[model samples]
Target chain A: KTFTQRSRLFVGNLPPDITEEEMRKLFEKYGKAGEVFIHKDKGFGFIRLETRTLAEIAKVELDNMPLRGKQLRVRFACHSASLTVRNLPQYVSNELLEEAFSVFGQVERAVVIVDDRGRPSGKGIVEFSGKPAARKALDRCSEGSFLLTTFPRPVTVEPMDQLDDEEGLPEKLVIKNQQFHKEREQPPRFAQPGSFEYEYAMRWKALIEMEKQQQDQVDRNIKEAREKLEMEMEAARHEH
Target chain B: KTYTQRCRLFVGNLPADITEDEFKRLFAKYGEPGEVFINKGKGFGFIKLESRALAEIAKAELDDTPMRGRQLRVRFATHAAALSVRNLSPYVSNELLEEAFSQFGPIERAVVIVDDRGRSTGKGIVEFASKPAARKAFERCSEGVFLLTTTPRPVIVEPLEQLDDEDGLPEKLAQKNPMYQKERETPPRFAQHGTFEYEYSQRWKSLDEMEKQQREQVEKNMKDAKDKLESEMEDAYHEHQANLLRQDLMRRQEELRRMEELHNQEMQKRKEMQLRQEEERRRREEEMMIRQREMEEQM
Candidate 1:
């Protein structure tokens, strides 16, 4: 379980008309498409690659591709341990953070991530010594356990997959999303007329509408359960 | 995960003589093998079927079909969606279903999923021009009766995109780079077994020395800048004194000139007084001489 697995790809959102040969040829670009396993029940496609490097490189090259009129979600499906921690105070030391989580479980090692100036990057990684301890820290989000009380400010935590590399991608790319003398040069979308407005207003509105519908549906279901199945509703609501 | 995928067929213990093209053609009953991939890593080979249903049909019927003096152990391919279809009924062919779906879009990349043995896995996807088109086709198919020459099963239509990069090089092409060859071979190691500790020691030693050198370089820069600043201050102070001396010399010369002018004026005044006195004396002598001569004549 210590990362010995070969890199495999999980291809989803498959259109029915696609051929295994075409997919194999596409996969073979990185390496021999080790083998093709078109899913039976799901009608999805999966393939094994030759190496970890191949898997990683393929992901960079392939994901978000369009084939047979469908945007392919080429997922490199290999993964493991490591957690991202955040909101650390500027002055907080690694040992302080270690002491912070030592109460929860055995911390293998803790790091105080720093910026280029070597200041606290406001994020770090806490590698748990053991599986159970790691699991303990993972679900320990939110609050309590006067245990971690050694530190002062609340240091919010998250996953480590994207901890250090979060600095580069563009953001708020536009703000003043408008104004003739816009703060940021016409942001790709916000900078453009029909663009920014559509992104902020129309697209976001549609997504919100869909989310609201889901919320409404859930609320209605909850109410219906309460009215029709009284005792079960509370149990279901609590469980849910 | 690929070899183990539900769609992946694992065919093992195959005769070496079977070529990839012939082996893949065995499953062409489903959909033409889009890009047939087989693992020649061993005597066994795997096929990639575009359609999962066709894969299912081939794997079902072709499992026991006699091929080249042996019962081919037909199953799924290993990874990268390379599928093996075994139990395909003898009747299924690639073009039958491909033609059926062609009404909605272009697809004569011909083949339906079944194996050389022939059978219906009752599985396959209808390719459309786009996701929306696929969605439209699914809706339309649901409303209408769709079939191949022999599919009794209601076909399931799902929209799928090729996530694999369309413009990628094959593994063989990727191997063209020298580094690619290096990747395939295990890299040489620093240590084999015993006394491995010393292998990384030199590297670490060099690394530590680098840090030391870096520290020394920083110290040297500070010293040089400090030295430069001290000398620059000394030069500035020397220039300050030189400026003061020049100012003092100019004042002294002006005072000396004033004294010389006063002395010269005093000398000229004294000379003029002497000349006037001489003139008065001469006039007085002439008057006395004339007075004496007149007195003598009167006597």
Candidate 2:
């Protein structure tokens, strides 16, 4: 029940020179192969199957099989809901994003964000038919540098929360605090906060606000800390 | 070494009906009997000698002499001093005691206490020259009801500690604490303030003794109860024949039943084979007669 029909197969210890075609050829012997992704570094990749039965067969037959110089480990892919691929080399296309993750699961949509100059923003968004496939693609492709089959783009996948913290909120807050300090420069020394001094202060305040917001988000999405404690107590009482 | 030398002869496989005198007579041929003790119910006893030479002589000469229904088992009684005797007869006398235990060791003192009417208190005590002698007496005289020849008379031998508790402490303490009621009870009276009564009371206390008088009274009552129980038990024991005859009978009956079943099965198979052979013989005879008649016709 924990695994589903469209689960992806993970293959590790791959030869660095292995191609998408080689990955497909190797895993297709066990089941119907949907897609194959071979990392440019040749360390690992994801192989998506059409059904859970195929994934299981592949897991049994392919696990511990020596591929390159290392024994391969295979398992059912985990699903995570929120993630974004960033720092993609320019010229990477939406098709390339789809092609890399298609081995993991069915791709609902993929977009390569661009800068104002109509150049690739070195970031992309990929949405899978379900969380499992997206999770598999993120786990396989997020950490390492890998060549895109259609383009020369190197991609990095990260959780969307990390990306927002890194670039979206902090950068915007820093710019906004700079503007406020510059605008209030004419007031008394005591009345007017120093532009240089206040700017640094505002940066710290922004970081605190961001931390609180993230905590608030966790409380809202999951359980509030207080409610979680109460629930745990109730569970303990029931156990007794 | 003296104790060890005394307890060396092991007697076993005694007949349940064999008396202690019979055991002593059977073993006396080898050496002079030092002490003899017949076990109450087990049909076995041990004999001691003044020296291992006598014990070895008994072991070699009377090891398998048949007495009652069983062969005698005689061996050097090793570690005889550690044995305990139980279920003794109430009316046992000093002469009977000597007859039962003399083969195990030299008797130093033999006493069987009696009341003014000369009825045994149902208990007797005997002292042997050595521990091995005492042990040998305890082992041989433990299980059966009779005395061996070495036995001067048929008397029960219990451990010294068991006799001490029964004859000495309980009666003396009861006489000291005579109380009829809780409120009118006398102040705590002890037999010997710090020695006997203090130690005894400290070791055993009745829970109902909330007040000092009540405590003393309760202790006295306990001692009386214990004394009465000992005498009652001894009386009950003497009324019955102290032998495990019923257990022996059941064992023998089970063995006999198994033997009978085996014999019956063998006889039944033999009878069935005989009947089949008779039938086969008749058929062969009829065939042979027909062949003879055909030969005459041809002639």
Candidate 3:
């Protein structure tokens, strides 16, 4: 059972040399902070407070104030109410997936990923009207109780934070290369199952596959069109 | 006299229907409000406080706070140090104007207004390194005792708050046109003993005639250079386009040549195969005739 009423904040324009300890102490001035996560090189972080009232007060006082020669941009963290569902069965259509999740709450949109040829890519996305509804659906799906269609592989429900990464919150950090982490405990590519890393890896892999297939389809279409024009030109020459 | 140290705050994202009384009360929480001027339809306003300390406190506390369902954007206001000078003799050069103002303090930049033909328009602008220097210059010059070079006409000075309208300060309301006022007053064009406007206009005409000869040669030189550049660019562009077209034509012709060569090679192969077949048939007929003759001999 997780507490869902935490006040998440976005602190931007942080100096590169700023430490997590400094941020923790600064946020602790207004209220008890839940988490103080900062990416030093990225110069931004997400800080969670115990309540929204404290978060609102801190944001009003801290915004546009200078710290370490950089003005801070403090605002309420905006998290996406969307969830990424993977390992979905091929027979599950986008409408079918929406019907499965509509039992919990109002669904704004539901899409089963498809390639250019309209073939199912075994991935789906469900956006609820509110985060509460999304949370309920994610809870039910993760418990193995929610299913669009029964199959050997069960659908996995994970929070899709990548969609709102540019707006705020460094909730997801994707490692670019595994070779750079050679001396680590284990490879990030083979993260433990059911972890956040594992879920992100699955989604990233699926997205890359979709993009590559689309590009290949375009290339093949161009080649076929060129060959067709060549054959027509050759036929015209023979007639002449 | 003006109070330059007043703390002006730009209260942006104001609600459309917000009134001055509400804004005054809101800003009164931190310190004494100087003036709260809200442009109701424009959704922004300026609020002046008594001191900078209070302004800083109010900005930090009120920034991003909701008022009448709209969040506020509070920031410090920036004003310009530029001043506009009019009623000048057209003979005054930009360099001479800078030299005159450099006596009070450091002059950042100065300019005398000129027409498109580089003739002076009897107006100038001078910017100082600091507001104090500008204030001093305005005070000393507005006394009507200063002269650039013993001319009968004295210049008028005005603060250039209109130039940086984007920042703050709603000082400029309307500018009076001297020409319109002159028409109503009905002054003679040739006033006796030279009034300010008459002397100013006469000097402008004199300076225009003096500078025209010097400017004509320079204009011709600039015009020549401009035309040369335009023609050169046009020629280069057309030449480049022609080269590209020629290259494309050559490539197409080469492809046609290769295709004709392949067609001729196929035709020659077909002709040689037919000739070989015809020769084989004739040889077979000759051999048959020879066999029949041998058979006849045996009989």
> Which candidate number would show the highest lDDT if scored against the true structure?
3
Q: What fraction of the reference interface contacts is present in each model, in order?
A: 0.00, 0.00, 0.00
C-alpha lDDT of residue B230 in model 1: 49
Off by over 4 Å in 3: A1-240, B1-205, B212-224
Instruction: DockQ for every model, please.
Output: 0.02, 0.00, 0.01
Candidate 2's residue-wise lDDT over A93-197, tens digit each?
565556666777777656666543344444567657677876776775634334443222234566653211001111122233443454323321211244323
lDDT of 2 by residue, B77-170 (tens): 4332333332233333356445556667777545555443343444455667668787666654443223322211122345553211001122
Find the number of clashing residue pairs for candidate 2. 43
Candidate number that wins on DockQ, 1 or 2:
1
- B84: Cα error in model 3, Å: 18
RMSD of 3: 36.1
Task: Please give, as one word, the docking class of candidate 1.
Answer: incorrect
Give the CAPRI rating of model 2. Answer: incorrect
- At residue A236, candidate 3 shows an lDDT of 44
Ranking the candidates on TM-score from highest down gives 3, 1, 2
lDDT string for model 1 (A13-126, tens) is 677766788777777677566667786346477677765556656665676677666677776542243566664443444555565677566665566665433344456676
Clashing pairs in 3: none
